[PDB]
Design an enzyme around this catalytic site. Structure first.
Site, PDB file in Angstrom:
ATOM      1  CE1 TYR A  28      -3.185  -2.959   1.152  1.00 46.12           C
ATOM      2  CE2 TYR A  28      -4.400  -1.450   0.183  1.00 46.12           C
ATOM      3  CZ  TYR A  28      -4.346  -2.687   0.483  1.00 46.12           C
ATOM      4  OH  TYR A  28      -5.195  -3.516   0.168  1.00 46.12           O
ATOM      5  N   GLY A  30       2.889   3.676  -1.548  1.00 41.24           N
ATOM      6  CA  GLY A  30       3.143   4.050  -2.781  1.00 41.24           C
ATOM      7  C   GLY A  30       1.670   4.558  -3.303  1.00 41.24           C
ATOM      8  N   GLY A  32      -1.385   4.034  -5.392  1.00 40.40           N
ATOM      9  CA  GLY A  32      -2.149   2.789  -5.372  1.00 40.40           C
ATOM     10  C   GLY A  32      -1.882   1.962  -4.077  1.00 40.40           C
ATOM     11  CG  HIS A  48      -2.546   8.322   3.728  1.00 43.66           C
ATOM     12  ND1 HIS A  48      -1.526   8.404   2.704  1.00 43.66           N
ATOM     13  CD2 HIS A  48      -2.856   9.557   4.300  1.00 43.66           C
ATOM     14  CE1 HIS A  48      -1.553   9.525   2.440  1.00 43.66           C
ATOM     15  NE2 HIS A  48      -2.010  10.285   3.355  1.00 43.66           N
ATOM     16  CG  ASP A  49      -3.377   4.059   0.026  1.00 45.39           C
ATOM     17  OD1 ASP A  49      -2.822   4.805   0.132  1.00 45.39           O
ATOM     18  OD2 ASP A  49      -3.158   3.072  -0.576  1.00 45.39           O
ATOM     19  CE1 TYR A  52      -4.387  11.746   1.262  1.00 41.33           C
ATOM     20  CE2 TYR A  52      -3.355  11.363  -0.834  1.00 41.33           C
ATOM     21  CZ  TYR A  52      -3.309  11.969   0.537  1.00 41.33           C
ATOM     22  OH  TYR A  52      -2.176  12.700   0.807  1.00 41.33           O
ATOM     23  CE1 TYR A  73      -1.248  19.657   4.759  1.00 40.66           C
ATOM     24  CE2 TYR A  73      -2.439  18.366   2.993  1.00 40.66           C
ATOM     25  CZ  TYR A  73      -1.341  18.392   4.081  1.00 40.66           C
ATOM     26  OH  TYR A  73      -0.558  17.194   4.066  1.00 40.66           O
ATOM     27  CG  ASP A  99      -1.646  14.174   3.981  1.00 42.04           C
ATOM     28  OD1 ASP A  99      -2.119  13.113   3.261  1.00 42.04           O
ATOM     29  OD2 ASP A  99      -1.303  15.282   3.058  1.00 42.04           O
TER      30      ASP A  99
HETATM   31  C1  LIG Z   1       5.182  12.302  -7.996  1.00 44.40           C
HETATM   32  C2  LIG Z   1       6.033  10.858  -7.460  1.00 44.40           C
HETATM   33  C3  LIG Z   1       5.883  10.852  -5.766  1.00 44.40           C
HETATM   34  C4  LIG Z   1       5.127   9.222  -5.696  1.00 44.40           C
HETATM   35  C5  LIG Z   1       5.547   8.802  -4.241  1.00 44.40           C
HETATM   36  C6  LIG Z   1       4.351   9.132  -3.338  1.00 44.40           C
HETATM   37  C7  LIG Z   1       3.187   7.947  -3.690  1.00 44.40           C
HETATM   38  C8  LIG Z   1       1.970   8.444  -3.543  1.00 44.40           C
HETATM   39  O1  LIG Z   1       1.594   9.025  -2.113  1.00 44.40           O
HETATM   40  C9  LIG Z   1       0.064   9.265  -1.831  1.00 44.40           C
HETATM   41  C10 LIG Z   1      -0.248   8.107  -0.918  1.00 44.40           C
HETATM   42  C11 LIG Z   1      -1.944   7.690  -1.018  1.00 44.40           C
HETATM   43  O2  LIG Z   1      -2.446   7.919  -2.384  1.00 44.40           O
HETATM   44  P1  LIG Z   1      -2.665   6.583  -3.317  1.00 44.40           P
HETATM   45  O3  LIG Z   1      -1.936   5.338  -2.827  1.00 44.40           O
HETATM   46  O4  LIG Z   1      -2.528   6.816  -4.682  1.00 44.40           O
HETATM   47  O5  LIG Z   1      -4.364   5.993  -3.211  1.00 44.40           O
HETATM   48  C12 LIG Z   1      -4.941   7.041  -2.446  1.00 44.40           C
HETATM   49  C13 LIG Z   1      -6.490   6.326  -2.568  1.00 44.40           C
HETATM   50  N1  LIG Z   1      -6.459   5.226  -1.922  1.00 44.40           N
HETATM   51  O6  LIG Z   1       0.403   7.739   0.346  1.00 44.40           O
HETATM   52  P2  LIG Z   1       0.726   6.517   0.520  1.00 44.40           P
HETATM   53  O7  LIG Z   1      -0.148   6.064   2.252  1.00 44.40           O
HETATM   54  O8  LIG Z   1       0.414   5.155  -0.210  1.00 44.40           O
HETATM   55  C14 LIG Z   1       2.592   6.231   1.187  1.00 44.40           C
HETATM   56  C15 LIG Z   1       3.492   7.442   0.591  1.00 44.40           C
HETATM   57  C16 LIG Z   1       4.635   7.436   1.599  1.00 44.40           C
HETATM   58  C17 LIG Z   1       5.659   7.761   0.489  1.00 44.40           C
HETATM   59  C18 LIG Z   1       6.184   8.889   0.742  1.00 44.40           C
HETATM   60  C19 LIG Z   1       5.758  10.237   0.326  1.00 44.40           C
HETATM   61  C20 LIG Z   1       6.140  11.382   0.843  1.00 44.40           C
HETATM   62 CA   LIG Z   2      -1.059   3.774  -1.529  1.00 41.61          CA
END
Ligand SMILES: CCCCCCCCOC[C@H](COP(=O)(O)OCCN)OP(=O)(O)CCCCCCC
Ligand SMILES: [Ca+2]
Ligand SMILES: CCCCCCCCOC[C@H](COP(=O)(O)OCCN)OP(=O)(O)CCCCCCC
Ligand SMILES: [Ca+2]
Lengths: 123, 123
Positions: A28, A30, A32, A48-49, A52, A73, A99
């Site tokens: 999860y 990343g 998706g 978190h996903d 969103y 924000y 977040d």
């Molecule tokens: C432009 C390139 C950047 C891509 C890297 C970040 C991935 C997306 O983060 C958004 C989401 C969640 O949005 P989605 O996975 O796209 O799905 C949301 C709806 N379920 O957070 P997450 O909980 O999956 C973990 C992110 C941690 C990585 C560090 C980032 C600061």
């Molecule tokens: Ca995700």
């Protein structure tokens, strides 16, 4: 937006570079995600996903042009604590909360390097 | 930047539209300023203007392309209190402090409508 999310995680974990440490972790963390979370950190990302996904069902979020990733924000980090600002309108305030919860969650669970770049044949 | 300053003043004075209520007041409230402040609110603006002048002498502020008016920083408003964020680098953190002090000052002094759009022949 993602860059506020990055700052929030660094607020809770000062020694981390979030985009490097948390991207592509488990099923999860990343863009998706799908399947059964591999551990608690992965579970944090699943919540978190889901958050969103809730945000997108909000009518307030529907009128905007920015998605949760590009929607800016305001929040502050002070003494390693995150505060979402009252200046955020409904949509951005919802995203800010999503977040904030995820940053705190990340800071409270174990990190398993073995799950970094997890092969998506387990998801 | 000015739009964070606007939000900060609204954080302390919820019923105000800052750009309308505080712009062009006395000899200092507004772009520039000179002469002897006409009252305490005007004095708040004089201190704020002096603060921005200090900011410009900072080497950290010298490397940036944005001036204090366009230089964005992060802060939060929560329960009518302003918190400058630890995510601000030196320059932006200095500016954030200048703006915070001025917002609080505005909220603590009398407002004299008679000084709105004061004729600059008294400055
Ligand atoms: C432009 C390139 C950047 C891509 C890297 C970040 C991935 C997306 O983060 C958004 C989401 C969640 O949005 P989605 O996975 O796209 O799905 C949301 C709806 N379920 O957070 P997450 O909980 O999956 C973990 C992110 C941690 C990585 C560090 C980032 C600061
Ligand atoms: Ca995700
Ligand atoms: C693009 C048009 C916007 C112009 C209106 C705001 C005037 C400039 O505000 C900046 C300064 C100070 O910068 P300077 O006067 O240009 O001089 C700084 C160096 N002394 O604050 P101030 O203390 O003079 C009072 C501002 C209150 C009005 C409401 C704004 C939210
Ligand atoms: Ca001025």
């Amino acid at each position: 937006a993602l860059w506020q999310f990055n700052g929030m995680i660094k607020c809770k974990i000062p020694s981390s570079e979030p985009l490097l440490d948390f991207n592509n972790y488990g099923c999860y963390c990343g863009l998706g995600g799908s399947g059964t979370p591999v551990d608690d950190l992965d579970r944090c990302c699943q919540t978190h996903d889901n958050c969103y996904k809730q945000a997108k069902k909000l009518d307030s979020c529907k009128v905007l042009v920015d998605n949760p990733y590009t929607n800016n924000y305001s929040y502050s980090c002070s003494n390693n604590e995150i505060t979402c600002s009252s200046e955020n309108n409904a949509c951005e305030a919802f995203i800010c909360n999503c977040d904030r919860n995820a940053a705190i969650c990340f800071s409270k669970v174990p990190y398993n390097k073995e799950h970094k770049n997890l092969d998506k044949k387990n998801c």
